[PDB]
Amino acid sequence: MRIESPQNPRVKALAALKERKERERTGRFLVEGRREVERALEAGLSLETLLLGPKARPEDRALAGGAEVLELSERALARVSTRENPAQVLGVFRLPRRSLAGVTLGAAPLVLVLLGLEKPGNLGAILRAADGAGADLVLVAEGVDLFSPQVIRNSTGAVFALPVYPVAEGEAARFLEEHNLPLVAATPEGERLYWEGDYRGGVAFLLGAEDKGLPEAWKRRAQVRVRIPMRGRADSLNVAVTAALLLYEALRQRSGGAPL
Amino acid sequence: MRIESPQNPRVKALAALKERKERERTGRFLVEGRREVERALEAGLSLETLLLGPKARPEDRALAGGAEVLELSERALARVSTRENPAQVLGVFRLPRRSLAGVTLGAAPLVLVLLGLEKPGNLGAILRAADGAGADLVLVAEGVDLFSPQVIRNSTGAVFALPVYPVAEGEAARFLEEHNLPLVAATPEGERLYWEGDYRGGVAFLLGAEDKGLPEAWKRRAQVRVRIPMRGRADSLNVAVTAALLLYEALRQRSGGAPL
Ligand SMILES: CSC[C@H]1O[C@@H](n2cnc3c(N)ncnc32)[C@H](O)[C@@H]1O
Ligand SMILES: CSC[C@H]1O[C@@H](n2cnc3c(N)ncnc32)[C@H](O)[C@@H]1O
Ligand SMILES: [Cl-]
Ligand SMILES: [Cl-]
Ligand SMILES: [Cl-]
Ligand SMILES: [Cl-]
Ligand SMILES: [Cl-]
The missing domain is CATH 3.40.1280.10 (SPOUT methyltransferase, trefoil knot domain)
Structure with a gap:
């Protein structure tokens, strides 16, 4: 239910998304921050995995829309975050397909x-x-x-x-x-x-x-x-x-x- | 004169100016970059020491106006600089005495x-x-x-x-x-x-x-x-x-x- 170790294979893989090469390899990207997650959802991007830190709000879990939800410890969260002060809400989204032809x-x-x-x-x-x-x-x-x-x-x-x-x-x-x-x-x-x-x-x-x-x-x-x-x-x-x-x-x- | 080693005491003194406490203690601050030194000079700030890197151009030396001139090696420059790619012209200026009352x-x-x-x-x-x-x-x-x-x-x-x-x-x-x-x-x-x-x-x-x-x-x-x-x-x-x-x-x- 709750991933505790920053050495957990799932945590290492999430932290790997910090690299553009990994995002391109996996076809996914991490959106850190409640507001940024809100915007990605509202823009219609596909949420694959919701990440919740120790201080997440009850409403945050309801953002999942059927996606996998992971609870992270402070240590595990700090590993995945690109912030000095890690957000309590993060989402792994699918890279989208778009072109000018649709403009x-x-x-x-x-x-x-x-x-x-x-x-x-x-x-x-x-x-x-x-x-x-x-x-x-x-x-x-x-x-x-x-x-x-x-x-x-x-x-x-x-x-x-x-x-x-x-x-x-x-x-x-x-x-x-x-x-x-x-x-x-x-x-x-x-x-x-x-x-x-x-x-x-x-x-x-x-x-x-x-x-x-x-x-x-x-x-x-x-x-x-x-x-x-x-x-x-x-x-x-x-x-x-x-x-x-x-x-x-x-x-x-x-x-x-x-x-x- | 030329300063070659990063361990030269002048280089350590120049590098100390990266801290606000040292600027306040000495009444001096470092201005890095040809453009920035030009602006400081044009503002009438007092130049105490001119620093020239290995790739400085002849006109740079004429900025001195009687100030001490130091020619730094690449490695000495690297220690004094606050940049990834150090500027070739820097100046140590005197902190000015300014009050809003004089405006x-x-x-x-x-x-x-x-x-x-x-x-x-x-x-x-x-x-x-x-x-x-x-x-x-x-x-x-x-x-x-x-x-x-x-x-x-x-x-x-x-x-x-x-x-x-x-x-x-x-x-x-x-x-x-x-x-x-x-x-x-x-x-x-x-x-x-x-x-x-x-x-x-x-x-x-x-x-x-x-x-x-x-x-x-x-x-x-x-x-x-x-x-x-x-x-x-x-x-x-x-x-x-x-x-x-x-x-x-x-x-x-x-x-x-x-x-x-
Ligand atoms: C950095 S956001 C906060 C400050 O920037 C200014 N600011 C930011 N956005 C606006 C805006 N759309 N209209 C007027 N002031 C703004 C305001 O003075 C505010 O105090
Ligand atoms: C060289 S800075 C990068 C770009 O910013 C734009 N830019 C920066 N300053 C100005 C300016 N004063 N007037 C018009 N465009 C500018 C120009 O498109 C320039 O190519
Ligand atoms: Cl809210
Ligand atoms: Cl940016
Ligand atoms: Cl015109
Ligand atoms: Cl010029
Ligand atoms: Cl600033």
Whole structure:
């Protein structure tokens, strides 16, 4: 009924999911935290195993929906957790099958295109901003991991309900072309202030990665290049901050505000 | 001169500066990174010792301005550095004697008031945005360390480029009153959208910390409470993201934009 040893074969296997290689091998991933488990369930992900720590609430067990439930000791729980302070509720979920083929957009979508691999921390924060501003689609680089403990924790589970898709650059470009999305490249030296863009119709914002920045080919194909002004001698802002600024400017305009 | 061994007593002394207690004891702090050293120098901070790694460039030596110059070996640099990949330019600066009493504001200041201690490394991010948006003053919590390797790195040196003062709540409240500054409280349930505030005149934005939010008395005292809309399931954004959105909304209005 209650797994006590951190050396239990079941506990070692659960702790193994901390590695992306193991998640890919098993086709499963661990969602740590009551709120994140709630979000995965509500997003429709399939719960395989519910994990309950010594201080779990009675309601937590009722989340199982017929999945296997495991009670863990503090020691066993600490082994499985990626937190300094382990959550009392965790769930092992099945990796989902999703693609862009199932995406349908309206006449004026709000789209974010994240090019390159971002520093850890940035994707989760971007996803939080996209959730807040109500982006209709987020494209990320192929091979970006949407199921790491890091992105689950840093997005506070926002990753699960958001329309976010890792896609190869060529297919991303074709998808945007096929849906006739105006591309707006965000770059520190862009010729237009970002407030002067018109985001009341469909827009796809293009953002580069913290180091290399936006690839020259993407900058050129965009119809507009916009900058966020920097009044100090700082070069650039963090990419997640930039994403939030762009998304909420679009929301301002869509809420009745005029472009500058 | 050249310092080769990690065991050289100067290297141990330089490495000791990683601790706040030692910075306080010596009246000195280390600034790592060419950009960060540039900002510290441009802020008028006193450079006592310039540190150059094996791959420093000729212009770096000319930053010294009469300060002692030490050429560190790779291994000596590794011990002094707080980074995985050490910077090639670092500087030991004198801790400045600053008081909020010496601050003078103009007719239309943009002020940020950060109440309570924040998570690492929210402050650094906030200061990057404040630098970018042209904030005139940032008030932070009483115990806050503005000279840690962490805040220097996370702010990319913006902590030097802005007036930032750690103050108790009472001192912040007195300062704001005596400058007769309109207080705008940012809170997820604020009665107005943040775009609806008028920030074309002097304004101080109030932001609370993650775990608490704003003290009720501060919220009540504010001229207006404003929300950033959240269109998804998440209730709140990260405090640093919120600060950037507020600051750049103020800049938008000061750049010709109208309140929504
Ligand atoms: C080099 S930082 C990574 C990306 O963030 C975006 N970014 C950072 N700062 C700004 C800025 N001031 N204006 C527009 N985009 C920015 C750009 O898309 C960049 O490629
Ligand atoms: C980090 S979440 C808590 C703090 O960030 C600010 N904050 C976070 N989200 C919002 C929001 N949607 N609207 C206004 N302020 C917010 C508020 O000032 C709060 O004190
Ligand atoms: Cl609850
Ligand atoms: Cl992340
Ligand atoms: Cl243009
Ligand atoms: Cl340079
Ligand atoms: Cl910080």
